Design an enzyme around this catalytic site. Structure first.
Site, short mmCIF file in Angstrom:
data_model
loop_
_atom_site.label_atom_id
_atom_site.label_comp_id
_atom_site.label_asym_id
_atom_site.label_seq_id
_atom_site.Cartn_x
_atom_site.Cartn_y
_atom_site.Cartn_z
N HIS B 41 0.70 -3.13 2.84
CA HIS B 41 0.15 -3.76 1.63
C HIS B 41 0.81 -5.08 1.26
O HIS B 41 0.25 -5.84 0.45
CB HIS B 41 0.17 -2.80 0.44
CG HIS B 41 1.30 -1.83 0.44
ND1 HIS B 41 1.30 -0.67 1.20
CD2 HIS B 41 2.45 -1.81 -0.27
CE1 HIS B 41 2.40 0.00 0.96
NE2 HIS B 41 3.12 -0.66 0.07
N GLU B 72 0.31 2.18 8.05
CA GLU B 72 0.81 1.56 6.82
C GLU B 72 2.09 0.75 6.97
O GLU B 72 2.79 0.55 6.00
CB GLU B 72 0.94 2.59 5.68
CG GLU B 72 0.98 1.99 4.28
CD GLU B 72 -0.35 1.40 3.82
OE1 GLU B 72 -1.39 1.62 4.51
OE2 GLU B 72 -0.34 0.70 2.78
N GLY B 146 6.57 -1.00 -7.53
CA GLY B 146 7.62 -1.97 -7.12
C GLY B 146 8.61 -1.44 -6.08
O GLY B 146 9.50 -2.16 -5.57
N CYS B 148 7.59 0.02 -3.32
CA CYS B 148 7.04 -0.25 -1.99
C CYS B 148 7.93 -1.18 -1.15
O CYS B 148 8.40 -2.22 -1.60
CB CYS B 148 5.56 -0.69 -2.09
SG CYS B 148 4.53 0.79 -2.47
#
Lengths: 181, 181
Positions: B41, B72, B146, B148
């Site tokens: 992401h 991911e 946050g 991540c």
């Protein structure tokens, strides 16, 4: 560092809560009986939220030394039936210095977070946001807002409560044994 | 927990950086040479900010398994002269499970913060925000936005990169040795 971390994690699980006043969300350390401590800036009112539940404040004492100098702690007595695990034996009689400390924070902004801050030195006097303050402990780490109320610990020691930061330096108010009783 | 903390702190000091893409600020782990890893992401563009300094991205690979299923992670190769300390020996060949893990985060929102997350279990398949994803590791802790990019570690092991959370459960993508080379 590792033993201080393990100590901190255990202490927070047993004695810490997350508290909201009209002035913000803070980590709160319960000390003995129904007495807890908050950074003075939390300015607790007649009721607080403690773990999302309304709790009445019976008493709040803004600590000052013998010459009226701010200590940046507020002690508060809670209208609640449960008693805190007595941790007064972990509180020193005088300002603690250590080679390795951890600062533990427990709020919505910082849920169960721990920061290695290394060496804690007795700083003493500080003009803290325009207020002369004493009994400050100092440590170097990249400080952020919301960390107020964090509990500063090393192995077997609760040293103080984080009350301020500037860039890469933080300050705790020393949490002394005699403040209780 | 203590040894995992000491390991995490050392690893972050040597191999971690704070990175900004157009999509946010992330913790970034450098792996070997000029190869690093980000949660997918982060969607890194042709340039990133790494410790506030512009750095060109030579290559970015969005990892998928043999059947095209999202993993991911994005691997990125950095246009920079310094080489990362080779940490590939800390990466497992398969999804790691441990009794005690720490998640380490290093951004402006969370500067050098560490979270004990306890047990890590191989979760495997997960529909991750509407995307079928595999090789997920799961741990229970109060998750916040946050985080991540956080690096999941236990003593002597880098397990994965935090990629998602829901309430009191977080998920990391497993960081496997074979992804490198």
């Amino acid at each position: 560092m590792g033993p201080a971390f393990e100590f901190a994690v255990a202490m927070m699980k047993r004695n810490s809560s997350t508290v909201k006043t009209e002035y913000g969300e803070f980590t709160m350390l319960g000390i003995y009986d129904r007495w807890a401590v908050l950074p003075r800036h939390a300015k607790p009112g007649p009721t607080i939220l403690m773990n999302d539940q309304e709790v009445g404040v019976l008493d709040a004492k803004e600590l000052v030394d013998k010459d009226g100098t701010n200590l940046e702690l507020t002690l508060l007595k809670l209208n609640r039936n449960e008693k805190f695990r007595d941790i007064r034996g972990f509180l020193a009689k005088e300002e603690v210095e250590v080679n390795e400390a951890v600062l533990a924070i427990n709020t919505s902004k910082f849920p169960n977070m721990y920061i290695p801050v290394g060496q804690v030195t007795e700083y003493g006097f500080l003009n803290l946001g325009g207020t002369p303050t004493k009994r400050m402990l100092m440590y170097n780490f990249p400080t952020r807002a919301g960390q107020c109320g964090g509990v500063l610990m090393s192995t077997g020691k609760v040293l103080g409560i984080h009350v301020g930061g500037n860039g890469h330096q933080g300050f705790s108010a020393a949490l002394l044994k005699h403040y209780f009783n």
